[PDB]
């Protein structure tokens, strides 16, 4: 099961055994990030957008120094059932963005007239054009550094001063 | 007659053709057949499908650069309003012209070509970011370099979403959003409008 997603008409071979699988293997990767993403809004923590942030970072940091990981990731932002996957993983992460954003806005931590739901969509934007330009070329986009100015630079749009850190990597949750 | 073909007229078909089939799909032949021709045609025009490819990549993207290329003209005072006008109105024609947004399509979701179509879109933002600093736009400390890369990832993001999600991710409506949040961070405040549909560039 594992053997065949991580050996993936050679998979079989690979593995040594006797679309689905892009898509297997997608899910098994965004599945971890999307739990982290979904703790952030948690009723028990009263720092939605400091956890938010640090998963986002600690989640950029991870990608770029596991090229394996990277090369899975990269799938799930290339080009029916891969389709569909990535759109659920679109959908999953941009409701539990705003439900962390939505918290934060509960406790006085966004700007005045700021909606989770913009909010959202914009640090799922910028998130995705930092993973795709890296994809593209690593020299002109570094996933560690430009990540963190492009996520700090949009949070700062819709989150008050004094709420996190910027610049500085947070903390593991 | 494979010689009379147009160069034009194997684009368009080449273009109809990746669209509905995909790149990796798509043969020489299915471009001749779709053309009215045979595979001779394209060869008339193109040494192979990568050219080809490559022809319909820059038809597309080339009026785009030109565009932006003018934003850090010495001939007006206003780079951050042109940059503004030339982002907003390309997405309004992404978001409304179809042919136009699967060619981006193709583009975005596919090596070599998206690099330096990059390297261009930066070079040209970067250099409209200096004019406005040299004309005191910028607010105090702003690298437009660093300003440039973060209006490319948060616009390509913007284009990735909308192509996945088009429920959720709004071309026009959250391009627009991005660019003015992102030239927020860097430009002087009541250097532009945010918000607002500015007139086509002249």
Not at 18 to 27: D, G, P, R
Not at 62 to 81: F, H, N, Q
Not at 118 to 130: D, E
């Given at each position: 099961r594992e053997g065949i997603l991580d050996a993936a008409e050679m998979i079989?071979?690979?593995?040594?055994?006797?679309?689905?699988v892009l898509a297997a293997i997608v899910e098994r990767v965004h599945l971890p990030f999307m739990q982290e993403l979904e703790r952030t809004?948690?009723?028990?923590?009263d720092t939605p957008v400091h956890d938010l942030r640090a998963v986002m970072i600690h989640s950029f940091i991870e990608l770029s120094e596991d090229e394996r990981l990277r090369k899975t990731m990269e799938i799930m932002l290339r080009s029916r059932v891969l389709t569909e996957m990535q759109q659920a993983g679109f959908r999953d992460a941009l409701d539990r963005m705003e439900r962390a954003l939505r918290r934060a806005r509960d406790l006085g931590q966004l700007r005045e007239g700021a909606d989770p739901k913009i909010a959202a969509r914009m640090l799922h934007a910028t998130v995705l054009g930092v993973l795709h330009g890296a994809m593209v070329e690593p020299e002109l986009m570094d996933l560690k550094r430009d990540g963190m100015l492009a996520l700090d630079m949009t949070l700062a749009a819709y989150v008050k001063d004094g709420v996190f850190v910027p610049g500085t990597v947070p903390e593991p949750l």
């Amino acid at each position: 099961r594992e053997g065949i997603l991580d050996a993936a008409e050679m998979i079989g071979a690979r593995a040594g055994y006797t679309s689905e699988v892009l898509a297997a293997i997608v899910e098994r990767v965004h599945l971890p990030f999307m739990q982290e993403l979904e703790r952030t809004s948690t009723d028990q923590r009263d720092t939605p957008v400091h956890d938010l942030r640090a998963v986002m970072i600690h989640s950029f940091i991870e990608l770029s120094e596991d090229e394996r990981l990277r090369k899975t990731m990269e799938i799930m932002l290339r080009s029916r059932v891969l389709t569909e996957m990535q759109q659920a993983g679109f959908r999953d992460a941009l409701d539990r963005m705003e439900r962390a954003l939505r918290r934060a806005r509960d406790l006085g931590q966004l700007r005045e007239g700021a909606d989770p739901k913009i909010a959202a969509r914009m640090l799922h934007a910028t998130v995705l054009g930092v993973l795709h330009g890296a994809m593209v070329e690593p020299e002109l986009m570094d996933l560690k550094r430009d990540g963190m100015l492009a996520l700090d630079m949009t949070l700062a749009a819709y989150v008050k001063d004094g709420v996190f850190v910027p610049g500085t990597v947070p903390e593991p949750l």
